[PDB]
Structure 1
Amino acid sequence: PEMVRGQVFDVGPRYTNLSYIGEGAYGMVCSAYDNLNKVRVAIKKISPFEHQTYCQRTLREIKILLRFRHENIIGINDIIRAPTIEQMKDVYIVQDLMETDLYKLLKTQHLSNDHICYFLYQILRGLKYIHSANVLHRDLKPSNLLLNTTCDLKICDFGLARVADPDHDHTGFLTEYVATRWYRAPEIMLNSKGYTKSIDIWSVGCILAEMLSNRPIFPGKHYLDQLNHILGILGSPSQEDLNCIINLKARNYLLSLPHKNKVPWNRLFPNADSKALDLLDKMLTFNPHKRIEVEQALAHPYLEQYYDPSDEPIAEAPFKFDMELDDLPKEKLKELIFEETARFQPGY
């Protein structure tokens, strides 16, 4: 097998001339030349089989992406693994080769307002499809947004996704970890399991703010610090919004804080389009029930140059229940991953 940085990366003979380009959750990402389709591609190595949770994250993403088909979601072109379960140690997922990700791009490039508008439109267009399938991405952040050389945007990594479950979303204070910290909605720390669509809208609002300034808007230094940063800009929640938090530990924490004023968006972003800041405000709304939904966001005046509901498709076959995976031992999960990837074997 071909090797990359002292690691097996066993994708040949179809895929050759490998280059390291980054990291996934359970292995490295490489570019490679596809000798059949005569184009370079991206390949993610996955090694999940020693751990139940890794197999869960792997199976969930494969099931989602094999059903999804959307221009702003990067799909699965091929899956490489051994012909038998005994011989299968790793799995490789082949996908379109993009130019960069938005995290890298924001490190060194200032975005024009036209780019911010186009990027945000494409994020929301893909999110509309995801949510229409009754699915939550639950880890939207710049490093999971890929861009090609003409600034087409695709959403990547569905390993943390779940089927939406708004009727079972309530939980206690300081118990939930959903998403990457800086993009985590305030209710995660207060009373939410992250089972409703508004969790994704908060993350998109954080990404919009980061596109406006090239810095994260809520850069918590650790778990507990995150809510300090959110409240420092949004200010103290209203009485109405506090009354929506029935959990006493969460509500009394907020009541124990000194008054904090709202920081006006146009003082934080003096160069920004005023329509962009209006939409930002609606996405970064404290109360998740008052927070703008994805189809409302697409119809906001900031996006008027792009908005076209007939060209913003929804899913043909939504997922009805979460795939029943927990307590399933890793052996049954390996068997399910094997079966789910069988369609790509030479043969079939």
Structure 2
Amino acid sequence: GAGPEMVRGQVFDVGPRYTNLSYIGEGAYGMVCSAYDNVNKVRVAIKKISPFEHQTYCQRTLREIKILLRFRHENIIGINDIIRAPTIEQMKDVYIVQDLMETDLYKLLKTQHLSNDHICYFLYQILRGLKYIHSANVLHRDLKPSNLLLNTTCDLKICDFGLARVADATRWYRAPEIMLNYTKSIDIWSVGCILAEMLSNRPIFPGKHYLDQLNHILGILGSPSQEDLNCIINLKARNYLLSLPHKNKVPWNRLFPNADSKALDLLDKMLTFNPHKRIEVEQALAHPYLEQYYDPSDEPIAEAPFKFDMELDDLPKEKLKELIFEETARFQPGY
């Protein structure tokens, strides 16, 4: 017998079906590896999570599992298999088996210059997947380059649905609403930040802290209008913003001198301060910049909207642990 697998001192008890592990990434309460599947004869991605000590991690874990099990779309990552201990007393870790992708957008932007057509094509696939997510009445809430996975043929899939929620983060990609004390339009903002980063290979709003984040935003958009501020904003944020000196709006064509003016027009409509005036996903797909890829015939939507039977916030982590145990039962031999 081989014994339990191990990656960087950390156990990976992924049975005899999954072997040849390599580190490919990490998260807050887990680690991602690639592995050889001896059944399907492919290498896969295994996501190990260890959520049980924290009630929030348990919540995210259950939420990600229920959603990815339900969603079925080519621009969304799925779950092919889930491994965990045969008993609830023994369950300290959950392993989620997923299609292996070549890399993420974070890394690609780190060493590659994108042509306009590739920007255009990546943008299309993000929005297409976001169409499905939003049709399901779900917010991803953490769109960013490292959560966008790419394969050898530039196919794109959204990953990490841990922060995903039923319709009502990373600082650089979070909408001004979020920080001003939300709806589907927070994802559009993130997609905007991502477009801007594909254009110049650098984040458009790299705030060191939440305050510095709001500065960077206003550093391009200009001082907020009266109506822009009026949104049940917290006293702190509003007073500070009102105390700042005037900031002039920087034109997109000056910040991205060589960018397709169509790309910039859409970029403008996504990075709109006021979320009510921000472009929605379908209107985005239909934008002239994407005409070459827009195909309403081939852009599927969720059969029905998503809903949670129980209110997960209210549940103690021991109740949540039980639910993760049950949700993952169907992947258990016998069953």
The TM-score with structure 2 as length reference comes to 0.95
| C-alpha separation in 2, matches of 1:246 and 1:338 | 40
The whole-number CA distance in structure 2 between the counterparts of 1:323 and 1:144 is 28
Please say which of residues 254-263 and 24-33 is displaced more in the overlay.
Answer: 254-263
Give the CA deviation at 1:254. Answer: 3.1
Instruction: Describe the shift of the 1:275–1:51 C-alpha distance in structure 2 as closer, same or farther (beyond 3 A).
Output: same
Give a deviation string over 1:7-55, Cα, whole Å, max 9, x none. Answer: 1101121111111111133111111111111110000111111221111
Query: Does the CA contact (< 8 Å) of 1:234 and 1:261 recur in 2?
Result: yes
Structure 1 residues 239 and 327, CA gap change in structure 2 (3 angstroms): closer
In structure 1, how many angstroms separate the alpha carbons of the residues matched to 2:330 and 2:234? 48
SS state at 1:259 partner: coil
For residue 309 of structure 1, report the CA deviation from its aligned partner: 1.1
Root-mean-square deviation over aligned CA pairs:
1.8
| Aligned equivalent of 1:54 | 57
* In structure 2, C-alpha distance between the alignment counterparts of 1:5 and 1:247, rounded to whole Å: 44
Aligned residue number for residue 316 of structure 2: 329
User: Aligned partners of 1:277 and 1:321: how far apart in 2?
Assistant: 38
Task: Output the CA distance in 1 between the equivalents of 2:177 and 2:142.
Answer: 15
- Select between 242-251 and 98-107 the one with higher mean Cα deviation: 242-251
**How do 1:310-321 and structure 2 match up within 5 A?**
310-320=297-307
For the pair 1:21 / 2:24, whether they are aligned, the reply is yes
Confirm or deny: 8 A CA contact 2:180 2:233 kept in the other structure.
no
SS at match of 2:109: helix
Contact 1:163–1:322 (CA under 8 A) maintained in structure 2: no
**Counterpart of 1:326 in 2: which secondary structure?**
helix
Using the alignment, how far apart are the partners of 1:320 and 1:295 within structure 2? 22
Post-superposition shift, 1:189? 2.2
Q: Deviations over 1:94-148 (max 9, x none)?
A: 0001000111111111111111000000000000111111110000110000000
Mapped partners of 1:259, 1:105: distance in 2? 37
Query: TM-score scaled by structure 1?
Result: 0.92
CA distance in 1, matches of 2:309, 2:104: 29
Q: Secondary structure at the match of 2:297?
A: helix
Aligned length in residues: 332
Change in Cα spacing, 1:7 to 1:126, as seen in structure 2 (3 Å) is same
Q: How does 1:108-119 map to 2 (within 5 A)?
A: 108-119=111-122
| Residues 245 and 251, structure 1, Cα contact 8 Å, conserved in 2 | no
- 1:101–1:143 CA contact under 8 A, matched in 2: yes
Q: Deviations over 1:286-314 (max 9, x none)?
A: 11100000000000000000101121111
| Structure-2 change in CA distance of 1:246 and 1:334 (3 Å) | closer
Give, in whole Å, the separation in 2 of the partners of 1:240 and 1:52: 38
CA distance in 1, matches of 2:258, 2:147: 26
Could you give the per-residue CA deviations for residues 181-226 of structure 1, whole angstroms, max 9, x where no partner exists?
00011122223xxx20111100000000000000000000112210
CA 1:242–1:25: 2 relative to 1, 3 Å: closer
The reply on whether 1:67 has 2:70 as its aligned counterpart is yes
SS in 2 for 1:278: helix
Q: CA deviation at 1:241?
A: 2.6
**What CA distance in whole angstroms lies between the structure 2 residues aligned with 1:327 and 1:312?**
36
